Structures are given as structure tokens and as C-alpha cells.
Amino acid sequence: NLPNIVILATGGTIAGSAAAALGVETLIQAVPELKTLANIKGEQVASIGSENMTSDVLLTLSKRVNELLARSDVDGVVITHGTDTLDESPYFLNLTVKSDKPVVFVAAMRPATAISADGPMNLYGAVKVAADKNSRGRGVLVVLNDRIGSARFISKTNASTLDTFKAPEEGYLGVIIGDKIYYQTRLDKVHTTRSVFDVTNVDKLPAVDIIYGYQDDPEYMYDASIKHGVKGIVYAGMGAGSVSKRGDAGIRKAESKGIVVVRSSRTGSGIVPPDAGQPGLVADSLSPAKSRILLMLALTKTTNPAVIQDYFHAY
Amino acid sequence: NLPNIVILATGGTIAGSAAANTQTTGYKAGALGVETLIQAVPELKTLANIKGEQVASIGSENMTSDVLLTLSKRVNELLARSDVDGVVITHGTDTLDESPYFLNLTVKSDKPVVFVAAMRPATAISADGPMNLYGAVKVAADKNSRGRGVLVVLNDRIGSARFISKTNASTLDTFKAPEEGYLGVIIGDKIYYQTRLDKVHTTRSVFDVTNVDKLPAVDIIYGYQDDPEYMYDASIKHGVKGIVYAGMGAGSVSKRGDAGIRKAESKGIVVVRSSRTGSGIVPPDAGQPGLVADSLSPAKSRILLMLALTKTTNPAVIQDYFHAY
Amino acid sequence: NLPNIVILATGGTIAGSAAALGVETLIQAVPELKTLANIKGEQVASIGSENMTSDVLLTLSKRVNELLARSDVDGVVITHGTDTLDESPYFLNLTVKSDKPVVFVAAMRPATAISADGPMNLYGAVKVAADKNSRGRGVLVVLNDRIGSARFISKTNASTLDTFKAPEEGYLGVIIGDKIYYQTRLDKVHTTRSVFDVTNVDKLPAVDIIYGYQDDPEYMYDASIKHGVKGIVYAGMGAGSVSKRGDAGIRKAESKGIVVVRSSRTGSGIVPPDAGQPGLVADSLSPAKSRILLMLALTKTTNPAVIQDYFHAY
Amino acid sequence: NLPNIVILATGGTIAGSAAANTQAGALGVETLIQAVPELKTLANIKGEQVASIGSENMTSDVLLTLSKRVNELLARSDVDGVVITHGTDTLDESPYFLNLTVKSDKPVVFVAAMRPATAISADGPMNLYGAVKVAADKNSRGRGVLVVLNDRIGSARFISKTNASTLDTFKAPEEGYLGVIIGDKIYYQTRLDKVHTTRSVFDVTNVDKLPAVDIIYGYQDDPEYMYDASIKHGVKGIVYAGMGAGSVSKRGDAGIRKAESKGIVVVRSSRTGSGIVPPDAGQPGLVADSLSPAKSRILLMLALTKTTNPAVIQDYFHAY
Numbered sequence A: 001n002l003p004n005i006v007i008l009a010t011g012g013t014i015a016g017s018a019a020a021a022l023g024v025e026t027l028i029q030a031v032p033e034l035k036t037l038a039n040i041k042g043e044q045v046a047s048i049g050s051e052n053m054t055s056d057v058l059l060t061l062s063k064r065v066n067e068l069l070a071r072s073d074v075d076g077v078v079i080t081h082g083t084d085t086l087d088e089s090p091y092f093l094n095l096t097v098k099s100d101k102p103v104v105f106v107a108a109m110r111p112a113t114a115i116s117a118d119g120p121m122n123l124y125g126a127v128k129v130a131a132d133k134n135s136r137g138r139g140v141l142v143v144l145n146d147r148i149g150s151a152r153f154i155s156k157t158n159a160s161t162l163d164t165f166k167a168p169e170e171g172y173l174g175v176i177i178g179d180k181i182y183y184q185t186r187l188d189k190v191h192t193t194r195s196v197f198d199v200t201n202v203d204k205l206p207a208v209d210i211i212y213g214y215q216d217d218p219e220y221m222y223d224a225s226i227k228h229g230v231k232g233i234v235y236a237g238m239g240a241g242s243v244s245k246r247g248d249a250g251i252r253k254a255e256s257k258g259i260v261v262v263r264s265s266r267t268g269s270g271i272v273p274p275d276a277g278q279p280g281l282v283a284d285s286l287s288p289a290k291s292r293i294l295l296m297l298a299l300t301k302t303t304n305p306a307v308i309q310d311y312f313h314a315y
Numbered sequence B: 001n002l003p004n005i006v007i008l009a010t011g012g013t014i015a016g017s018a019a020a021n022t023q024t025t026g027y028k029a030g031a032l033g034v035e036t037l038i039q040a041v042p043e044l045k046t047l048a049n050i051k052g053e054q055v056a057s058i059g060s061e062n063m064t065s066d067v068l069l070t071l072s073k074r075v076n077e078l079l080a081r082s083d084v085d086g087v088v089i090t091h092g093t094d095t096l097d098e099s100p101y102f103l104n105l106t107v108k109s110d111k112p113v114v115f116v117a118a119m120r121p122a123t124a125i126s127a128d129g130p131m132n133l134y135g136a137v138k139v140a141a142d143k144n145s146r147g148r149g150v151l152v153v154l155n156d157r158i159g160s161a162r163f164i165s166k167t168n169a170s171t172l173d174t175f176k177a178p179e180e181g182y183l184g185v186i187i188g189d190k191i192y193y194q195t196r197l198d199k200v201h202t203t204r205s206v207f208d209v210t211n212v213d214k215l216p217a218v219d220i221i222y223g224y225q226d227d228p229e230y231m232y233d234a235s236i237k238h239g240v241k242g243i244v245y246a247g248m249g250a251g252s253v254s255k256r257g258d259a260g261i262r263k264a265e266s267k268g269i270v271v272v273r274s275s276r277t278g279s280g281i282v283p284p285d286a287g288q289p290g291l292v293a294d295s296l297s298p299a300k301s302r303i304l305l306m307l308a309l310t311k312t313t314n315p316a317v318i319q320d321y322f323h324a325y
Numbered sequence C: 001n002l003p004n005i006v007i008l009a010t011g012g013t014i015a016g017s018a019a020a021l022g023v024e025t026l027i028q029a030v031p032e033l034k035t036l037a038n039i040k041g042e043q044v045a046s047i048g049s050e051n052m053t054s055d056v057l058l059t060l061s062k063r064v065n066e067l068l069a070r071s072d073v074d075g076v077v078i079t080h081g082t083d084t085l086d087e088s089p090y091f092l093n094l095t096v097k098s099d100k101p102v103v104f105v106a107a108m109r110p111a112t113a114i115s116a117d118g119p120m121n122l123y124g125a126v127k128v129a130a131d132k133n134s135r136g137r138g139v140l141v142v143l144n145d146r147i148g149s150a151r152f153i154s155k156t157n158a159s160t161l162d163t164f165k166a167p168e169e170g171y172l173g174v175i176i177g178d179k180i181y182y183q184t185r186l187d188k189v190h191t192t193r194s195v196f197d198v199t200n201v202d203k204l205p206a207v208d209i210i211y212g213y214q215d216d217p218e219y220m221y222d223a224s225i226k227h228g229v230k231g232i233v234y235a236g237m238g239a240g241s242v243s244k245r246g247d248a249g250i251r252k253a254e255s256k257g258i259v260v261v262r263s264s265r266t267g268s269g270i271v272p273p274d275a276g277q278p279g280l281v282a283d284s285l286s287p288a289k290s291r292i293l294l295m296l297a298l299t300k301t302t303n304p305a306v307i308q309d310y311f312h313a314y
Numbered sequence D: 001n002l003p004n005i006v007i008l009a010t011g012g013t014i015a016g017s018a019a020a021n022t023q024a025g026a027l028g029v030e031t032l033i034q035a036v037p038e039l040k041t042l043a044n045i046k047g048e049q050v051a052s053i054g055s056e057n058m059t060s061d062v063l064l065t066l067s068k069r070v071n072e073l074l075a076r077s078d079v080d081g082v083v084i085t086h087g088t089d090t091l092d093e094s095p096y097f098l099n100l101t102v103k104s105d106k107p108v109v110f111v112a113a114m115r116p117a118t119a120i121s122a123d124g125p126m127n128l129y130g131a132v133k134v135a136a137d138k139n140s141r142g143r144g145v146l147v148v149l150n151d152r153i154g155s156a157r158f159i160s161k162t163n164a165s166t167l168d169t170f171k172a173p174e175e176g177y178l179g180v181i182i183g184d185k186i187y188y189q190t191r192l193d194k195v196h197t198t199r200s201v202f203d204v205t206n207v208d209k210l211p212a213v214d215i216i217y218g219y220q221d222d223p224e225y226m227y228d229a230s231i232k233h234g235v236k237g238i239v240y241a242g243m244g245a246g247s248v249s250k251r252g253d254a255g256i257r258k259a260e261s262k263g264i265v266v267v268r269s270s271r272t273g274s275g276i277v278p279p280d281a282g283q284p285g286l287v288a289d290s291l292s293p294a295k296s297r298i299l300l301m302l303a304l305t306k307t308t309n310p311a312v313i314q315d316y317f318h319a320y
Ligand SMILES: N[C@@H](CC(=O)O)C(=O)O
Pocket: A011, A012, A013, A014, A048, A049, A050, A051, A081, A082, A083, A084, A085, A107, A108, A109, A110, B249, B252
């Protein structure tokens, strides 16, 4: 009679130890309170720092997620993950998961052996959220610090705080307070069941690099991407994707070689607006790191700029 | 009879023209002169005797350190004069993260140095420029602005060069510091100071570019999943003196990054691990290469690192700098 | 071919003169509205929103409902002051019953100020209202290039242009470079799905807001009691926490049939249920929005459990 | 060798228990101290139990007691600083009281915790550690009264509970934090540009009862009678939690004026949660500057022990 939730562990600080790494079965054991929310099965997809998360491991994760959500005896899925790269992995699965069932990413800033470690509660909130049927159809979820954020908006905004994960402009989809879920907001983009993206039959994703925008920014960074035959480049623009004349050169250069370039921003938030005056596609409100994921996945369907641009406004 | 303020222009949307007023995105930055700017706010004659000066007429995307030196040498030139009470600097927003901070390190006077910008062209409806400029001259003329570090004014806020930054691509209230706030606000034609910068700045800064003609080259390299090593090889192949890593979370290096950083350190390039995050502390970790950016943005870390390398190549001296400025 | 939009004028700083105004002056001032829609102006009232009252709200609410029921009205823009934009839009959010966009707009600076925000806000509001894609999103609050939900957004700073924020909830959408980007949707009961109708209401119940604080006087409840208020909202310390003096005074009111909601003086967040304390609980609703919900709920029911649920659903 | 730090306990959720860890009985100061053995690496601790209450119930009387005692401790050469355990519900006020009230350079760090000590991932232990770390840094000196939760060091003058229930609640969007605590080092970033502690004129050393000040909220249809009830019960000051920038409706206008008739001092603050309420000649009452309703009661309250002069009280609000 209780929901059947699978915890796929991938590593991260939620799984570390010290005197201030640890497998899935322990994370579960450190919170016996999980018993009261779901029947839990644990599975170890990887044990790496999320900084070392790569498109390849994401292909395995995504495939295993869809494989499990296809099952009649799996109600939702909770994914244990680091925070340094939690910007990208949930957005990946938001684009790539074929189910309506809850996929929920959980993480912690303090390791399990820290004074007032956030992992235990984050995990509890994440399983509770996953075990809720009202949690379906919401897109991939990101749960830490009592907040349920959308994979499309939520990112790490502070380097070291427990409350890092924010989306200033779009808030949190909802909230977990006093052992109650409080949904307030619904993502208004294409995701999960409605997404045209399918990585089920993909062995390898196209390479996509990220170039920063800044005063005196080198044109030779683009030459690198161009040389190594990268498929896409995400410019992390000054302000609203603004390019200097080196950005301009580098980008236009890349574009003649058939490299799809998307101008995002280095600011943290907001719309990069369309502009005939500048080269490259526009990222809408997509962060540089999430733009990479969308571009990377977009480059498995098409190379067409207007089409991909279309994705960038809808996804 | 009243304070003598000088406005030094560098271009930017504050001085952008556009064909129509409904249009907010995609125009000509630095199309108009400091005199056109000043003329549109005749209210400034209530605050200051104003002299305008055109240092540059570029969009701040194209702001180069070469113009920064020139600008920094000029501010110091003026504030040393008896007839100059404070400077206002009109500037783009795209790169207003870095120019204020630069002069925060290189200005040598108590006097107010207030950068000012607009998110909307002068032609836009409800253009923020005039009010912003009014506030900028206000702050500058007020003796009580003295010794507060270099200041950034937009949207009735007075932020510190050290903390403030463009936090949104396109909104008027872009310039924020979640963790540090604003030194002061401007409300009902009054200045309210609330905060002071608890870092080293201006008069007490050890960095002096009065006689420097070429600042050392510093590249920023982003952190992300599947980040390539070859970007580090690129900076090395080009004789760069410092690299700022815009790291994942608190400057976390991937395998590729660790190796890339480490190649750079071999050939004597100083590496600072900053954060793509947007705020907060990158703490020392002796299990990771390069030094640590404290709470300085990749943009700002690039500036300090650059100016640091004019003084020393000592990794420990520079690490001290990040913790102090 | 171009959408029909009625701008309903209520007053506010968006319509103020200085030495450093009717709906038609406002319209005249943004000639670019003509590119967005065909515009009719109406002056519902001309007050500072600080002087906005339930009975003017009713007049407005019915008029809005009346306008939106026409074939030839596509949407409604309400010009209004900021000091009470917390309340007015939420009111309409529950009482309106078309999917047609109802867009409140305001300005922190008067039209005469350097870099006055009125014109641009008014432009945005109309653009939003004239967009087919705006339908059925609940009542909206446009200022400073954001589309806020009436359920969430509130004045968070006394005097800045960007005052209107909902930290926990962000914006519904945004207006950048002359285009609208919708991003999130109100996951609460609103407009067409709301049970709250005021068509047949002449006077709304009286509801007071009492502030929570160290040494808070119990007599404030005694006062609200003397004047036979129907409901009290408590702007509690923290998550709606009562002192002994608040505990007893609320319990006092509750025994006289007055319905008490416990909200927060904090600015955001959930006041969770608690059997150890009296009053109902305000979910994430502010004190000012709690008033609007409670006073409307009092037109329907006096039943604590039903009222309580409204606060979790609406 | 190590700094001597006194912990003064007043109660609060930091000292709060519950039946299960997934969700109240009181816990002593020494229970809080033994829960964190790592404190001994930071300082010598003395525990002192001043009160044991929810901060809902914190009164101006106990704050007087809390003040006199903190001044008495800090006056000693062998006391380097004091950490105060206090509920979150009324940390808006107590800290600011002490900020005007303490005569010492020496750190006064308030600490609290949003989740009970009993709760899974409870925030009490780490918060206090932080609070003691700050109180035992000699660099915490001369910064005014300090508030530590969620790794942040906030100024008493600015910081407030902005969310009902979350861990990161205590913010000040316009002013930020004075410092933060990250990876077991303190990082100072900002200084309070206001009169505080040693420069304050507010002396309650010989004050037994504080004047009464009510807070009356501003809203649509706001009743004039709140003001009358304030008046009837001999209140010496009223703080107005106004609409926008302390804006008064016809009723608050009449009501304030009435209270001004009786020599009740009124301050127009704001219900919004941040920002400047400007002077407006065409409106009654004094003006709060950027002070919240809660902190305004506190500043008004103390000003009325010193003076009843409208001009002088207004100066306090632009200075403190
Ligand atoms: N390096 C860690 C950081 C964290 O989880 O907080 C990670 O795996 O992402």
C-alpha cells in the first residue's frame, strides 16, 4: 500500500565523509524515517564528484530512469547527486525522460558527517516529494533546503550556502514545510512526456563547449572549439549575450564551419533577447550550463538554426 | 559656490540612440555625447557645476584594459586637482562588473568615483538614464560619499565596486549583491548610507598603474560537465600570465580542469579558482590546484589577478590579495 | 483586427502631478498603445490606493465582470496605486470569472518624475492584456517589466521601482525587448474556477489585521470585538506564533463567532497548522491577502474547516 | 590561551524538543553545549540560563534584564564576548534592543534555530558553533550586535525573519550580511554604517519599566479605533506599519493625529519589509527611515526614556 521509490545514487557531497564515498544503502540507513513514506530500493549508478559528471554517465542515468519508470512497480525515482553540476543533470533528464512519474534530484552542501548536515532532511523531502502522486506532470524536480525547484530554472547561485539553489525570477515550484508538500507554481515549458528529445538510441552526444564573455576576451578560444571539431558552442555572454568584436569574429568563424552557436549570459538570470545585429542563436532565459544541455540534445535531431532557436524558446 | 563634479564618458546604453521608443533590445551604444547626456537632465545644475569629458564612445562589451588604464590615470589626474570634487563615469552595463572594481584598486583619492549606467537607451520610454545620472551626480557631490570606495549607481541604489554586478541580462534592477547589499540607497531626493566596504580600497590600495602601459594577459575559463582540457592549452600557447577558472560550485575542478590548471602552473601562469555560481566563498582546499577567489566573481577575480601580476608572481602574496581586496 | 482593451482608472501615483490625472491624460501620454490595441478609458475612481476600500473594490469587481462578459472586450487594464496593490489584484483574482486578462498596473514614480515608470509599465500592461497567450493565468500585476501573479506578488520595498517581488514564487512572466516570456503558472484556484462571486453582494464583512510583536496588547482584540468585526487576520511573529496575550485575545474573539486566521508578519513562507494554537492558518498568504480571502470567504461560509481549506486551495 | 565566552539562554526552538525527529519540551543551556563538543576547540564556555520561553512571549522587561546582565558580563576583563540563545519569532527585536543598549566593544552574537534540536538535519548545533566562532574572534569587535544562523552573520540593525519557516529566513535584501562563515573561517565583508553599542546614548542601566509602544497595521478599510484603544490605555508611543512608504488612509491619518493630540509619539514605518519611508510634510507622524515596524517599536521605546522631543526622536531614526 505505500509507494515504491527507487533511489539511484550518483555520488556528490550528500555521499561524502570526513572529520569536518558513502554508498546508497547507508544514505537510506541514516534516515529510517523513509520507511513511512515509501518502499525503498537503492541503486548505485556511479560514485563520483558531480564536477566529474559527463554526458556519457548522463546517458546511462537517463536510460535507466526511463527503464524504471516504464515499470508498473516503480512509482517515482529519486536521484542522489552532487551540487556543482546539479544545474545540468536535472535539465538533461527534464528533456529526456519519457514518463510523467516524479524524477527528483536530491543533494547536500554539507557532507553526511558534518554538524547540522543537510543530506538527511534533503533526502527525506526528496523521497516524500517523489512518493506524492500530485508530484506528477511537473517536470524534473530539484529538492534541497525545503524547496522543490524546476530543472528548467533552478541552479546553484551561491558557492557554499545551504540555500544555494534559487531561481530569483521563477521561484520554486513548491515547498516542503512541517512534513507537508505545498505546490504553488507550475513550469510553463515543454518537458518530459511532451519533449521531442529521445536519447534512448544514442551512444554518444555531440561535444559542446562554453566560452566566457569578458573584457579583453580572446578570439583564440573559439579557434580551439573549431579545431577540436566541437559541434556546438555556448557563449556565456557579457550582460545579454553581448559579444565584443573578438566574440563576434570567433562566433562568425565557428558558424561558417557549421557550428551552432547560442548566446546565453554570464549574469545568472534573465532573457537574452533576439538581435539581428549580433551573430548566433539566442538562449532565451537559459543559463550557459543548461543551454549546453539543450544544444547538446538539440544536435541529435537537427543542425537547423531556426528550428533549434525554436527549441530554445519552448524548452 | 557649490560642488564641482566632472563627468567622464565611455559610451554604453546610457548614451545609446534608437529609431523608436517602444524598443528596448538591439540599438546603438555610445551614439551620443556627454553633453547630450548632461543637457537632458537640466536638474543637475541644482546639485553641481558640471564639466563633461568624452574618454571613449564604445559599448562596454568592447571595454579593454587599455582604455581602463587611460581612464584610471585620468580620474587620478582630476581628483588630485583642487577644482574637482568627484567624478561620475557613464558606462555600459555589460562589463560594469569589472571597470568599477578596476578603479576601486587604482584610484588614489578619498573623493567619490561613481560609475553610472542605464539598461534602457535614452530614446526608450521610461529611460532609466536621466534618473540614474541625477543620482550619480548627487552621490558624487555629497561630501559624505567620501572614502567609501568606488561606487556604482542605478535604480536608486549605490553599490560597491567590490560586490555589485549585473545579475540579470535585461532588467532595470540588475545590479545587486545578494550577500553584501548596497552601501546606500537614494530615496526622495536624499542619500541614505547604510553599509561600508570592509575590504581594502583606493587610498589604501597597493596597486598603482600611473606608469603602467600594458597590463598582463588574463583569460577566464569556464567550468562545466565535459569541460575540455584544450582551453588551458590555448591560454598557454598564447603567453597568458594568469587564468581565472569560472569553476563549478565553489571552484571545483574536474579531472580535465585539474590537469589543465596544473599545466598552466608548470609554465608559471597564476591560476585562481572562482565560481560560475554568482556569489559566495570559494574556500581554500589543498587537494585542489590554483589559488582561491574568496567571494570575487570570475570577472572581478580577473581584474585583481591582472593588477596583482604587475606587482608579484608569488602565489602566496596573490592569495593574500584576494582575501584583502 | 486589433484587440479591444478597456483601461479602468482607479487613481494612484501612475496618475500623479508634482513640481519636480485622469485616465485619458495617461492614455494620451503613451501613443504607442495604439500599436497594441483599440483602447477605451474609464474613470472608476481617482484616489490614492492607500484609501482603497472594499466598497470601491466591489464597484470595480462587478464592473470588470460586466466588461469581460462582452463580445467586444478582450481584456482589462486597471491603473492603481502601489500602496495597496497587495490587496486589489488578489480581490479580483477570486471574484473575476472570465479567462480574459485582467492586468493591474502601477508606477512608483509620478508621471512628472525623471525617468517616470508609468508610461513603460502602462505599455507593458496593455501588451500583456492584448496577448491571447495571457488568458486564464489569473489576474496579473505588471510593473518593472515583470508579470506578477495576484496570489503571490506584493510590495516588498517601500520606495523602489522593483518593489514587486515574490521571492518564493518568482514571476509568471517577463517583458523584454518588446516581447512576452511566460515562464510559470499559478498552481492555485483562480478566476473562472473560483467559487467567490460578488455579483450579489452590497457590503463586504469587516476584517481586521492585528500585528504580532513583543508585548503585544490583548486590548487590540477587545477593540475589534467591540465593533463586531466578522474576521480577524493575525500578522503573527514568525510562522503565525501567538503570545499569551495574543493566544487569549484570539480565543476571546473565536468564542464570539469571529473567524481568526493566523498569518505572518515576516513577508513570505508557510504558516503551518498547529493544534496547540487557536485561529486558522494562512498557508503562504500574507496578512493583507489573508484579509481579502477571509472577508470574501465570509460571504460564503462561517465554517472553520471550509474556510481553512480555501486558504490552502486559493 | 582560549577566549572566555558566556552563553546566555532565553529559550527558543534552538532549545526545543519534540516526540519524533520528523517534526515542545524545553532544553537547558548545558544540553545545548554538550550537544556540540567541538565548541571547546573555540572557547571556554560558561552557560547561563536567563529565561526559558518562546520568543513570542519575550517582553521588554526580560530584555531589560538581558541587557543589564550582558553589560555586567562584558565589563569584566575575563569575558571576551557573549552568545545569546533566543527564539527566531522575535529576533527581529531583541538584537536591535541590545544594539542600542550594550556599552561594550566586545561581540554580542545572537543565535537561534528554525528546526527543533530534535529534528532531522536540525540547524541548532551548527548555528551555535558559528555563533561561538564569531563571538570568540577578536575581529568580531566593534561591529554592533550580531545575528548568526545558516552560516550568515547579520547586523542586528538590518536583519529580520523574512520567511515563516525556512532555514535561510534571516536576510536583509537591501543591506546584505556583515559577514559569512564558510569552511570554518569567518569572512567579514560589510560594516554597519549606523550608531551602535559604544556610541549609543541609550542607557537603560537604571531603568525598571520601559514605555509602552503599540504597533498598528495599515491596510484597506483600516479602523480608526485601533488608535483609540492605543490612546485609552496610556501608550507612550505608536508605530504605524503603513501601506507602501508609511502611507496613511483617512482613518490612520485621523487616528495618528488624535494620538499626537495626547503627546503620543507616532512613527510611520512600512509593512513591506524593506526600504526608506521618506519624510512627507503633508502627512502626520515621524518617519522610520529604513527601520521595520518591530525595530521601530524598539527605537521609539528607548527614545521615550530619554526625550519626548519630536525633532530629536526623528534624528535617532536617521542615525541608529
Ligand atoms: N563537489 C561536490 C559538491 C557538493 O555536492 O556540494 C559535488 O559532488 O557536487
